RNA sequence: CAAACGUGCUACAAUGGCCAAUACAAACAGUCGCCAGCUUGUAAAAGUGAGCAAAUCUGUAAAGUUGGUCUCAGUUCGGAUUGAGGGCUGCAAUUCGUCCUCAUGAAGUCGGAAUCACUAGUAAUCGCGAAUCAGCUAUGUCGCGGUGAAUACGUUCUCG
RNA sequence: GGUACACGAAAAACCUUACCUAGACUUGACAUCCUUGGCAAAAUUAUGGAAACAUAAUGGAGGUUAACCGAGUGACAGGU
């Protein structure tokens, strides 16, 4: 009985596969060791942020497939993906996970550049005199 | 019975969207009224080109409007057609806007 | 800069006059509008009147001026002194 | 005490003028405008 | 000096690099859209009348 | 040090020491370094006579650093003794290539000699 | 003229020593938008602190930052000539924020070597109330004490 | 071009310079074009040459991670200027194209009085693409994504 | 001034180009209306040419003049 979750953040998909196991979780991202797929700049804890405060002793085998974005965006996708898979095993977990706001799409994406402006919200220097 | 055309790959593209859906409905209805197994009317990504034009005639480059032109695209591949379908394919009359990429 | 395979460049109108003018002993200034023609070894010894834009400035080519462009040894604009604004 | 001279330019550039003059006398009016050709249509219903 | 330049642009030049693109409706030389052969200020008038199929206003 | 009249820093690696010579930059220094086979990252102070002769020989084979200054000097004189407009432009201490001279190009004009902008009492 | 109070974004608990404040100072030393670089620099300084002070780095950091934290804040209020200052009690959130800003500002000006050792020295130099950030806090406190009279009038 | 101002780029550096290995985008564009691979070349590029009328083929992602080195110097910073040799486009590169290689190494060590923008994927910053275009020191313009902050107590003052 | 100054110009070597110096033209490089014929304009090769332009050449798609190629012709074309 596996579980599936689909997270997204900054145009980055995520396919998280939750498999019941009792021989250590063995976190895995895109068939590669997390310490090598990510700059291992301590970003690994973030994805596990909702999998820590509840538990990881249940040794859920993680099968992550992420295609798109940079590396923090990919990390954001799997946290939501981990949480969406978590919403099929013990619907109580949802309540406490909802609290910390770890069950909401961040809704934050890069704005479009506007004409006459040096960026999304920047604007040229103004000279009066 | 014959085929005379294996893997007829019809490709659709048009500047408009609603006409494109209409043409796919008409194409599918005729081709299913004859004995052909349609793979399916799949959508392809729409190539969008955007041109930026300054509104003012002489000065004020800052005030510049924008225009877009979308090339909506669809794919449709027919397995076996035969004369029974091909002869009925002659009376389809595709609205001008829709563009065909028949590849045989 | 200029490629190798291409080589040098003369308009071949300047080249034809120079060949004709070198054979003739009593050479006189050659009126050429081609500031684009590079100075070829055969040009040596002749004198040309390059169009600066207004007049024809006379240049006497030597065995040393060889290689650059014929218009490079003449000017086009002139600036020699400003004037106090205030 | 002088090792004659190892400069003087000319010689090297002389080959360059010869190359340029040979090109100029070679010049063939091969004026053209294009590259790839054919495969230019918008299709139909193969007979409408 | 407009009419003479328009006629000369239609006529073929003696060098390939001598050929430039001028708007086909008016005679404006700069800011010509090769995708449409129409300058920026004729493209606005034409786009606001519906003559060019598919050029709608953009919202992005 | 000992290489001609140049005094390469003694506490600095050889590949940078060669750059300190006038006629030898960095890329050409590496060419001499690789050609002589002497391994880089070897502080010049911790180097032996066997390398000091080979490096000198290849440097002598290349263009002498002292002759380059007179080579550039003859070339400017060569350009000015022809009467070229480029020579004239180099002559009056101005940009020799196509650089603009309206509001910029002060690296060849030294410090600014502020004059008096026009007087505008309005019109 | 606004009548609205701005919201506040989360501070985040630190990922190592679980001391929020570490993330704030990381963001303070941020330059060129490099999260990675800043974490490395800062974290390296705690390791240098271990090698030198033989004590827990979080405890030393709190002892430095808590000691640097000011109490009074002087707000400029001009009427006719110059400005008569007004001492006011700063909130707790701004207290930590101002402390961190000064710590970073005097750290990127020390005569030391790589900013790892530079920033490491400033914090260890501030745990004993003898440094550059301390002097700044001392100066503003003395200025407020001198201008105690106008504290009653604010605006 | 004796000068002055405006808007930007590059810097004055170890949050960095150089070298090696290496992970992760979105959007757009393309048959006088995109050009894979291969051969030659210190390199810009040349020759051969498939593939792609395109969710198929092509347009190397960089910051970022690790390792080595520099050890704070007007320097392995900074790249101006200048000399020479090459490559591409084009009849044609001197006036007046840009790229590469070599050579040189101006000023500049945070900038006076005074000023500008910005309230989250925003400021800052790193690359990518397109338009006009044979080519173009567009560092410009219009777009796309990677990393990603700080602060807002309040209307006494300031501008509208 | 704010509301000009990487603005018109989303590409000034030739072209662009509207400027200057020169070499050439006059119902004109382009157009209509009128009396009138079409048995061409191109492009390119020669010579003189800075190139405009001239003198000689293959005399040219076609469709009998459709479009244009012209003659005659004054109203006029043309002006960044
Ligand atoms: Mg007009
Ligand atoms: Mg220039
Ligand atoms: Mg800009
Ligand atoms: Mg380093
Ligand atoms: Mg594939
Ligand atoms: Mg200095
Ligand atoms: Mg540098
Ligand atoms: Mg040049
Ligand atoms: Mg310094
Ligand atoms: Mg706001
Ligand atoms: Mg910047
Ligand atoms: Mg105004
Ligand atoms: Mg011109
Ligand atoms: Mg006939
Ligand atoms: Mg007839
Ligand atoms: Mg008028
Ligand atoms: Zn127009």
Distance separating alpha carbons of residues A16 and A103, to the nearest angstrom = 15
Count of structural domains, chain B: 1
For strand H, is any atom closer than 7 Å to the CB of G91?
yes
Q: Which residues are bridge partners to B66 per DSSP?
A: B52
Token pair recorded at residue C30:
């050659």
Query: B59 C-alpha to center of ligand 13: Å?
Result: 25
Is the Cα torsion angle B84, B86, B87, B92 positive or negative in sign? positive
Cβ contacts of F16 within 8 Å, gap of 6 or more: F9, F26, F29
Residue C10 three-state SS: coil
User: With contact defined as beta carbons under 8 Å apart, do G73 and G63 qualify?
Assistant: no
Is the Cα torsion angle B16, B19, B22, B27 positive or negative in sign? negative
Q: Whose structure tokens read 């460049």? A: C9
Q: For residue G57, count CB atoms less than 10 angstroms from its CB and return exposed for 0-12, middle for 13-18, buried for 19 or more.
A: buried
Residue G94 lies in a domain: yes
Breaks in chain A at C–N > 2.5 Å: after which residues? none
Distance separating alpha carbons of residues C17 and C46, to the nearest angstrom = 11
Among D9, D10, D16, beta carbon nearest to C8? D16
Chain CA centroid to CA E7, Å: 14
Distance separating alpha carbons of residues E39 and E22, to the nearest angstrom = 8
This structure's resolution (Å) is 3.0
**Degrees to nearest 5, angle at CA A18 with A83 and A39:** 70
Determine the protein residue whose CA lies at the shortest distance from the C1' of H101. F27
Distance separating alpha carbons of residues D8 and C74, to the nearest angstrom = 24
For strand I, is any atom closer than 7 Å to the CB of C34?
yes
Distance separating alpha carbons of residues G139 and G74, to the nearest angstrom = 11
Distance separating alpha carbons of residues A108 and A9, to the nearest angstrom = 8
Task: Provide the CB-side half-sphere exposure for G100 (13 A, CA).
Answer: 19
Residue G69 lies in a domain: yes
Total residue length of chain E: 60
Closest-CA residue of chain B to A118 = B62
HEC sequence for B51-90: EEEECCCCCCCCCEEEEEEEEEEEEEEEEECHHHHHHHHH
Residue B28 backbone dihedrals phi, psi, to 5 degrees: -65, -45
CA G148 to C1' H98 (Å) is: 68
Torsion of CA G5, G6, G7, G11, to 10 degrees: -120
The parent domain of residue G137 ranges over 20-152
G27 closest-nt by C1' vs CA = H149
Count of structural domains, chain G: 1
Total residue length of chain D: 48
User: With contact defined as beta carbons under 8 Å apart, do A83 and A103 qualify?
Assistant: yes
- Among residues F8, F123, F122, the alpha carbon closest in space to that of F65 is found at F8
Distance separating alpha carbons of residues C15 and D44, to the nearest angstrom = 59
Cβ contacts of C29 within 8 Å, gap of 6 or more: C47, C48, C49, C56, C58
Neighbours of B89 (CB within 10 A): 22
**Whether D39 contacts chain B with CB within 8 A:** no
Residue A61 backbone dihedrals phi, psi, to 5 degrees: -70, 125
Residue C49 three-state SS: strand
- Among residues A86, A87, A78, A81, the alpha carbon closest in space to that of A34 is found at A78
**Whether G15 contacts chain A with CB within 8 A:** yes
Distance separating alpha carbons of residues C40 and C18, to the nearest angstrom = 10
Give the bases of strand H that a protein CB approaches within 7 Å: 1-8, 14-16, 23-29, 31-33, 53-55, 61-66, 69, 71-72, 75-76, 80-99, 101-106, 115-125, 131-134, 137, 141-158, 160
Local structure of residue G151 (DSSP, 8 states): G
- Among residues A107, C64, B12, B48, the alpha carbon closest in space to that of D9 is found at C64
- Among residues F101, F104, F99, F81, the alpha carbon closest in space to that of F91 is found at F81
* Domain locations along chain A: 1-128
Q: Whose structure tokens read 């402006």? A: A117
Local structure of residue A30 (DSSP, 8 states): T
Q: Which residues are bridge partners to C38 per DSSP?
A: C69
User: With contact defined as beta carbons under 8 Å apart, do E45 and E56 qualify?
Assistant: no
Run of H or E including B45: strand B42-54
Residue E57 three-state SS: strand
Distance separating alpha carbons of residues F16 and F29, to the nearest angstrom = 8
Residue F97 three-state SS: coil
Cβ contacts of E40 within 8 Å, gap of 6 or more: B53, B54, E31, E32, E33
For strand I, is any atom closer than 7 Å to the CB of C69?
no
- Among residues A39, D30, F85, G67, the alpha carbon closest in space to that of C53 is found at F85
Q: List Cβ<8 Å contacts ≥24 apart for C52-56.
A: C52/C76, C53/C77, C56/C29, C56/C31
Q: Whose structure tokens read 């009985």? A: A1
Total residue length of chain C: 86
Residue G4 lies in a domain: no
Token pair recorded at residue E48:
């606001």
Distance separating alpha carbons of residues B52 and F84, to the nearest angstrom = 47
Helix axis angle for G115-126 and G57-68, nearest 10°, is: 70
F76 closest-nt by C1' vs CA = H83
Residue ranges of the alpha helices (H) in E13-53? Answer: 40-47
What residues of E are designated binding site for Zn(2+)?
A: 23, 26, 39, 42
For strand H, is any atom closer than 7 Å to the CB of A17?
no
Please state whether beta strands E38-39 and E32-33 pair in parallel, antiparallel, or not at all (unpaired).
antiparallel
HEC sequence for F31-78: HHHHHHCCCCCCEHHHCCHHHHHHHHHHHHHCCCHHHHHHHHHHHHHH
Token pair recorded at residue G9:
């974004």
For residue G120, give the CATH number of its domain. 1.10.455.10
User: With contact defined as beta carbons under 8 Å apart, do E49 and B65 qualify?
Assistant: no
Query: E7 C-alpha to center of ligand 15: Å?
Result: 30
Whether residue D45 and residue B99 make contact (CB cut-off 8 A), yes or no, is no
N- to C-terminal Cα distance for chain B? 19
The parent domain of residue B72 ranges over 3-103
Q: Choose from C39, C41, C44, C61 for mutation: most chain D CBs within 10 A.
A: C41
Q: For residue A93, count CB atoms less than 10 angstroms from its CB and return exposed for 0-12, middle for 13-18, buried for 19 or more.
A: middle
Q: Whose structure tokens read 């002139």? A: C78
Total residue length of chain G: 155
Run of H or E including G104: helix G92-107
Torsion of CA F35, F38, F44, F47, to 10 degrees: -130
User: With contact defined as beta carbons under 8 Å apart, do A30 and A63 qualify?
Assistant: no
**Degrees to nearest 5, angle at CA F26 with F22 and F28:** 85
User: With contact defined as beta carbons under 8 Å apart, do C48 and C70 qualify?
Assistant: yes
User: With contact defined as beta carbons under 8 Å apart, do F78 and F90 qualify?
Assistant: no
Q: Whose structure tokens read 């898979």? A: A85
Task: Provide the CB-side half-sphere exposure for G90 (13 A, CA).
Answer: 18
Please state whether beta strands G72-77 and G84-89 pair in parallel, antiparallel, or not at all (unpaired).
antiparallel
User: With left for phi above 0 and alpha for psi between -120 and 50, is residue F4 left, alpha or beta?
Assistant: left
Residue E47 backbone dihedrals phi, psi, to 5 degrees: -70, -35
Distance separating alpha carbons of residues G83 and G76, to the nearest angstrom = 6
Is the Cα torsion angle A7, A8, A9, A14 positive or negative in sign? positive
Token pair recorded at residue G107:
């750290």
Q: Which residues are bridge partners to B74 per DSSP?
A: B12, B43
Residue E3 three-state SS: helix
Helix axis angle for G35-53 and G21-29, nearest 10°, is: 120
Query: A119 C-alpha to center of ligand 10: Å?
Result: 15
Whether residue F84 and residue C84 make contact (CB cut-off 8 A), yes or no, is no
- Elucidation method: cryo-EM
G4 alpha carbon, closest ligand = 10
Q: Whose structure tokens read 């169009």? A: C51
Which of chain A's residues have a Cβ under 8 Å away from the Cβ of B63?
A: 116
- Among residues C45, C67, C56, the alpha carbon closest in space to that of F79 is found at C67
User: With contact defined as beta carbons under 8 Å apart, do A57 and A65 qualify?
Assistant: no
């Amino acid at each position: 009985q596996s579980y599936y979750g689909l997270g997204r953040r900054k145009s980055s998909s995520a396919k998280v596969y939750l498999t019941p196991t009792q021989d250590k979780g063995k976190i895995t991202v895109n068939r590669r060791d997390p310490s090598e797929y990510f700059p291992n700049k301590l970003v690994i804890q973030d994805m596990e942020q909702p999998l820590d405060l509840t538990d990881l002793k249940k040794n859920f085998d993680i099968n992550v497939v992420v295609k798109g974005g940079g590396f923090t965006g990919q990390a954001g996708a799997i946290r939501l993906g981990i949480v969406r898979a978590l919403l099929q095993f013990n619907p109580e977990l949802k309540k406490i996970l909802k609290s910390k706001k770890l069950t909401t799409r961040d809704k934050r994406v890069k704005e479009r550049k506007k004409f006459g402006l040096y960026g999304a919200r920047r604007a040229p220097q103004f000279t009066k005199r | 019975n014959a085929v005379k055309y294996p893997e007829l790959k019809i490709k659709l593209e048009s500047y408009d969207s609603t006409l494109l859906d209409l043409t796919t409905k008409k194409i599918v209805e005729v081709v299913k009224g004859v004995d052909v197994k349609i793979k399916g009317p799949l959508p392809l990504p729409t190539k969008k080109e955007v041109i930026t034009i300054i509104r003012s005639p002489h000065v004020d480059k800052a005030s510049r409007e924008q225009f877009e032109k979308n090339r909506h695209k669809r794919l449709m591949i027919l397995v076996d057609v035969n004369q029974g379908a091909i002869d009925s394919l002659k009376r389809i009359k595709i609205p001008v806007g829709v563009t065909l990429r028949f590849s045989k | 800069s200029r490629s190798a395979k291409k080589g040098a460049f003369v308009d071949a109108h300047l080249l034809k006059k120079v060949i004709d003018m070198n054979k003739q002993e009593k050479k006189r200034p050659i009126k050429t509008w081609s500031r684009r023609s590079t100075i070829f070894p055969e040009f040596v010894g002749n004198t040309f009147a390059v169009h600066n834009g207004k007049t024809f400035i006379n240049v006497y080519v030597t065995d040393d001026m060889v290689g650059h462009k014929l218009g490079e040894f003449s000017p086009t604009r002139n600036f020699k002194q400003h004037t106090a604004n205030r | 005490l002088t090792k004659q001279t190892v400069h003087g330019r000319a010689e090297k550039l002389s080959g360059k003028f010869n190359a340029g003059k040979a090109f100029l006398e070679n010049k063939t009016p091969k004026k053209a405008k294009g590259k790839t050709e054919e495969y230019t249509k918008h299709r139909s219903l193969n007979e409408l | 000096a407009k009419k003479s330049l328009k006629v000369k642009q239609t006529r073929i030049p003696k060098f390939a690099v001598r050929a430039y693109t001028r708007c086909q409706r008016c005679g404006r030389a700069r800011a010509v859209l090769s995708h449409f052969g129409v300058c920026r200020l004729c493209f606005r008038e034409l786009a606001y009348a519906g003559a060019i199929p598919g050029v709608k206003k953009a919202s992005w | 040090a000992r290489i001609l009249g140049i005094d390469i820093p003694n506490q600095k690696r050889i590949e940078i020491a060669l750059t300190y010579i006038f006629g030898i930059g960095l890329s050409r220094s590496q060419a001499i370094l690789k050609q002589a086979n002497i391994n880089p990252d070897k502080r010049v102070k911790d180097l032996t006579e066997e390398e000091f002769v080979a490096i000198r020989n290849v440097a002598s084979a290349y263009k002498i650093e002292g002759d380059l200054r007179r080579e550039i000097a003859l070339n400017i004189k060569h350009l000015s003794e022809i009467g070229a407009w480029r020579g004239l432009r180099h002559r009056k201490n101005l940009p020799v290539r196509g650089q603009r001279t309206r509001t910029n190009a002060r690296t060849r004009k030294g410090p600014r000699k502020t004059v008096a902008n026009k007087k505008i009492e309005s019109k | 003229m606004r009548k609205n109070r701005a919201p506040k974004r989360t501070v985040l608990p630190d990922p190592v020593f679980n001391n929020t404040l570490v993330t704030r100072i990381i963001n303070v030393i941020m330059e060129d938008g490099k999260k990675g670089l800043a974490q490395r620099i800062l974290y390296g300084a705690f390791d240098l602190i271990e090698q030198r002070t033989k004590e827990k780095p979080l405890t030393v950091f709190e002892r430095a930052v808590g000691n640097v934290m000011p109490r009074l804040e002087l707000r400029v209020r001009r009427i006719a000539g110059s400005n008569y200052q007004v001492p006011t009690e700063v909130p707790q959130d701004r207290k930590i924020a101002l402390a961190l800003r000064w710590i970073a500002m005097f750290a990127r000006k020390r005569h030391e070597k790589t900013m790892l050792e530079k920033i490491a020295n400033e914090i260890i130099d501030a745990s004993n109330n003898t440094g550059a950030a301390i002097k700044k806090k001392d100066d503003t406190h003395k200025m407020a004490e001198a201008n105690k009279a106008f504290a009653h009038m604010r605006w």
